[PDB]
Structure formats: structure tokens, C-alpha cells
């Protein structure tokens, strides 16, 4: 039978290879190009990250929600995949035209010069594979296929490292940039192979179609994807600027390092919510079964993140020695605060994915505004006085009261 634990086991395997391939490539980035190349590729790598969400108009969470909803009805399933295929095709071709025509302005903003126009024109084809690969991974998530999604990410991570090494050893710095963009793009080969071998959907379902009522619903998931790409990231951006003002930019660096390894080890659990929790809650239409599934998920993820966080705290000196440069070994005190906030943030993700599974833009704006407001009140109170440590208390206290409000709002929604 399918459960969150079985999906977490397959997710933990793909996440182990994903962070391992990212650490290997990242270390090769530093040895080959150093801080100078790492600073030039900062805006480019962020573009690749936002392309993983914005290449297919961010409908992937809606694709997973509606594929699971219409997992039985074949006719409506054709219209879900058909409309999703047309939106991914139309948006990525429009993005490719924007990247190929305005290659000079984008290079001017991403690198400061115009010497990277050809790289931007190559991104136009790269983001096409990113959008299509993310779509195929969304369909496999809608059918709760944890093995198909994990195997596609693992194989795509291996050929992504080989492609980076081939492109870097051939084209050099611009080749290493193309390889960094090709790592999320080459997942379309294992995703397509896994899509037709397991036979989850016929290939004719990918033929572009248009359902008006279904295109507007996926458009609501586009608005939600556009909201997360600005709301909380801007809040954090304001936090680093306030920290860099009252203290040093390196004091922002020790807070970024603790949060970086926090994002890696939390991905063992958060990546399984889109494989099991999102499709399961979309099929459930009764509040009795929704309450049972949400409570059952909290019974598993809360001890899981708490055990994983504790072991990270016991190995916090090990992380600073390896994953960090071991430059400011005093950040070991920033761990316990961030790791407690990681536990309560994971618990609140269950209520957040329930909001996604029900396509509630109302409860979505409410959730993002609450986290934005609480993060900003606690940052202005702790950062100017406690430094990077206070930035962790602001992160911990925000999600301590956010999980409490999520529980209270869920209780009022149940009764």
C-alpha cells in the first residue's frame, strides 16, 4: 500500500543523490573558477532556480492536483494533460523567444556585460527541457508514483553531472554555466522513459489541447506559484539587508550557511509531500478523511524532522568542517534555534499542502501574508540586537506561532 513513509524512502534516495551531485558540482565550481566565477554566476544560477518553477507557468502543483483528482476518469484526464501540455508548450516557446531576442539585456543584468548572449540563447532551449521535464514529473506525482519520480531524478542527476563535466571541460566557464542549466533540463530523458515504460499515461495524452474551465484552474496555481517566488524570498532579502546594516555581510554568511544545510536535510521530507500528501488530499473530499490524513501525516513527519534535526545538531561541528569552510566555527550556536524552527515549519507544511490540494487562493494569501508579517516583526526585534543568532530566533519564533495559528485555523475550519 502507498503511504508517506514509502514515498519518503524513495524521496530520501533521490535527495541523497541530488545533494551529492550538487555538492560534487559545487566543489568543482569553486576549484575551477573560485570566488570570481562564483560571483558572476550568482544571478545566472538564481535564474536557473526560478526557471525550475516558472518555465511551465508554475502549473505543476495544479497538474499533480488534477491528475490525481481525475486519476479514474480517462476523458477528463486527457483534458488535464492536454491543457497542461499546451500551457507548457506555449509559455516555454514564449520564454524562448524572449530569451533569444533580448539576449543582450538579460546578459547585462545577470552578468554586467554583453559577452553572454549565446549562453542566454542556449538557455532558451534549456528552459524548454526544464518545463517539459517538470511536467512529466508532475504527472507521475499525480499518480503517487514515488519510484518513478525518484528514479527519474537519480538518473537525471548522474547524466547531469556527466553533462556538466563534458561542457565544462570543453567550453570552460560558459560551458560550466550551460552544464549548470542542463542539470535540471536533462531530467526530461529519464522522466519520459519512466513515463512510457510504466505506462501511467499514453503518449497521445500529451497532445496539446485546451479546456477553458481547466486552464483557468491551472491559472490559479500559476498565481500561487508566482506568489511564493516573491513573498517570502523578499522578506528574507530584507532580513539580510537589515543584518548587513547592523553587522557584517559575513554575519549574514553564517546565517545563510545554517539555512543552506537546513534546506538540504529538510528536502528528505518536504519533497515527499508533493508525491503523496498533495495527491492524497486532493482525492479526499470529506473533512473527516482530510482530518485523519492530516493528523496521520503530522504523527510521522514531526518525530521524523525532530530526529533528523537532533542528529544534525549532534553533527553540527561535522557540518561546519566539511559543508562549510570552517571559517567562523561560532555558528554552532545558530543551529539549535534554526533546527527547532525547521521542525515546526515542516509541521505547518502539512496544512500548506492541504491548501494547495484544495486550490484555495484565499487561504494561500492568508498563509503567505502571515509568515511575511511574523518574519518581519521578529526580524526587526531580534536581528539588530542579536545578530545572525537573532535571525534564527526570528525564524524559529515565526514558525512557532505560525504552526500554532495553522492548528487553530484548521480546528475552526473543521468544526
Amino acid at each position, epitope marked *: 500500500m502507498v503511504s508517506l513513509a514509502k514515498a519518503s524512502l524513495w524521496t530520501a534516495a533521490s535527495t541523497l543523490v541530488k545533494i551529492g551531485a550538487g555538492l560534487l558540482v559545487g566543489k568543482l565550481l569553486a*576549484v575551477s*573558477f573560485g570566488p*570570481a566565477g562564483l560571483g558572476l554566476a550568482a544571478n545566472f544560477r538564481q535564474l536557473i532556480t526560478v526557471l525550475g518553477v516558472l518555465a511551465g507557468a508554475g502549473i505543476f502543483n495544479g497538474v499533480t492536483k488534477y491528475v490525481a483528482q481525475y486519476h479514474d476518469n480517462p476523458q477528463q484526464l486527457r483534458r488535464v494533460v492536454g491543457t497542461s501540455s499546451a500551457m507548457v508548450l506555449g509559455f516555454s516557446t514564449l520564454m524562448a523567444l524572449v530569451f533569444v531576442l533580448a539576449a543582450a539585456p538579460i546578459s547585462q543584468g545577470l*552578468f554586467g556585460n554583453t*559577452d553572454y548572449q549565446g549562453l542566454v540563447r542556449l538557455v532558451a532551449l534549456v528552459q524548454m527541457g526544464i518545463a517539459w521535464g517538470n511536467l512529466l514529473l508532475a504527472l507521475m506525482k499525480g499518480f503517487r508514483d514515488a519510484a518513478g519520480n525518484a528514479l527519474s531524478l537519480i538518473v537525471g542527476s548522474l547524466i547531469g553531472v556527466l553533462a556538466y563535466y563534458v561542457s565544462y571541460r570543453l567550453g570552460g*566557464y*560558459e560551458g560550466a554555466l550551460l552544464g549548470l542549466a542542463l542539470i535540471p533540463a536533462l531530467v526530461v530523458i529519464p522522466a519520459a522513459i519512466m513515463l512510457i515504460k510504466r505506462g501511467v499515461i499514453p503518449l497521445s495524452y500529451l497532445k496539446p489541447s485546451w479546456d477553458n474551465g481547466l486552464a483557468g484552474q491551472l491559472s490559479k496555481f500559476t498565481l500561487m506559484a508566482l506568489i511564493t517566488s516573491v513573498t517570502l524570498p523578499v522578506a528574507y532579502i530584507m532580513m539580510r539587508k537589515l543584518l548587513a546594516a547592523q553587522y557584517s555581510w559575513d554575519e549574514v554568511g553564517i546565517w545563510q550557511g545554517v539555512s543552506s544545510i537546513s534546506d538540504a536535510y529538510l528536502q528528505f521530507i518536504t519533497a515527499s509531500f508533493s508525491v503523496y500528501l498533495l495527491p492524497t488530499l486532493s482525492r479526499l473530499t470529506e473533512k473527516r478523511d482530510i482530518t485523519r490524513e492530516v493528523v496521520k501525516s503530522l504523527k510521522f513527519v514531526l518525530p521524523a524532522v525532530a530526529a533528523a534535526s537532533f542528529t544534525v545538531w549532534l553533527l553540527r561541528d561535522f557540518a561546519i568542517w566539511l559543508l562549510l569552510s570552517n571559517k567562523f566555527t561560532a555558528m554552532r550556536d545558530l543551529f539549535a534555534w534554526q533546527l527547532v524552527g525547521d521542525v515546526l515549519k515542516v509541521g505547518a507544511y502539512v496544512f500548506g499542502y492541504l491548501v494547495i490540494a484544495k486550490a484555495s487562493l484565499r487561504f494561500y494569501i492568508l498563509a503567505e501574508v502571515s509568515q511575511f508579517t511574523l518574519l518581519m516583526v521578529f526580524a526587526h526585534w531580534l536581528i539588530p540586537a542579536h545578530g545572525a543568532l537573532g535571525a534564527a530566533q526570528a525564524y524559529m519564533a515565526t514558525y512557532i506561532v505560525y504552526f500554532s495559528l495553522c492548528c487553530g485555523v484548521f480546528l475552526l475550519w473543521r468544526r
Partner: nanobody, 128 residues
Framework: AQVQLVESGGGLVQAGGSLGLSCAAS????????MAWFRQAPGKEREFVAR????????DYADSVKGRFTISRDNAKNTIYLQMNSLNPGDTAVYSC?????????????????????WGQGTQVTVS
């Protein structure tokens, strides 16, 4: 730790003449760096001219300046030269020198300007 490139030797020469350019790079590990020359016509784009490697004096030239221009390096004086012979009015451009690491240049990326992080201001070369 940014290297500074200062070009010199630019002027106005008649057609068929010759003029030599120099570019001094600031810092150590000059012998470990890959040097190159680029030019830019008025209203055009940065185009490849010449490039010297980090060992054995491996050189690469653009087809338009092959046999006419000659690039050379001097690790003792931290400078590189571009002897421009057989000048024609098509060579009227601002010539700039660039510095990079062999891990950047790769195998086929020695002519791409985006693979040279450090650049010079550029000196003018005008052919009548």
C-alpha cells in the same frame, strides 16, 4: 584579488604599416594565466584577435589577423605583446587585453569574451 590590465602602444598608422601593442598585468601568477587580445570596431561587438596559453607558448589567432598579427608573452615583466603587421583600415578599433585561467578557457572556449573575467580599458588603433 583582481588583476589590472594596462594597455599601451596605440596610435594612428598608415595602410600597410606596423604597430606594436603591450599590456601589463598586475599581480603574481602571470605565468599561470591565459592572455588574449580583443578589438571592437565603432558600433560593433567584441571580436577575437589573438590568445596565448600558459605553457609551451600555444597561440591562437583569428582568421582575419592570421599571418599579420603576432602575440607574445613575457612572464618576467608581466606583460604581453601584439605585433600588428600589414595593417589595413579594417583594423581601426579599440584593442583590449584580457586575462583568464586555463580552467576557464577549456578546449574550444578561448575565443569567447565571456570566459575572461578581467579586462583592460582598451587602447585605440587607427589605420588610415
Amino acid at each position: 584579488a583582481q588583476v589590472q590590465l594596462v594597455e599601451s602602444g596605440g596610435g594612428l598608422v598608415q595602410a600597410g604599416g606596423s604597430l606594436g601593442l603591450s599590456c601589463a598585468a598586475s599581480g603574481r601568477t602571470f605565468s599561470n594565466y591565459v592572455m588574449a587580445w580583443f578589438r571592437q570596431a565603432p558600433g560593433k561587438e567584441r571580436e577575437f584577435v589573438a590568445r596565448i596559453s600558459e605553457s609551451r607558448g600555444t597561440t591562437d589567432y583569428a582568421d582575419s589577423v592570421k599571418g599579420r598579427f603576432t602575440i607574445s608573452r613575457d612572464n618576467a615583466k608581466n606583460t604581453i605583446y601584439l605585433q600588428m603587421n600589414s595593417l589595413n583600415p579594417g583594423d581601426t578599433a579599440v584593442y583590449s587585453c584580457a586575462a583568464t585561467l586555463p580552467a576557464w578557457t577549456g578546449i574550444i572556449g578561448g575565443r569567447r569574451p565571456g570566459n575572461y573575467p578581467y579586462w583592460g580599458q582598451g587602447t585605440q588603433v587607427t589605420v588610415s
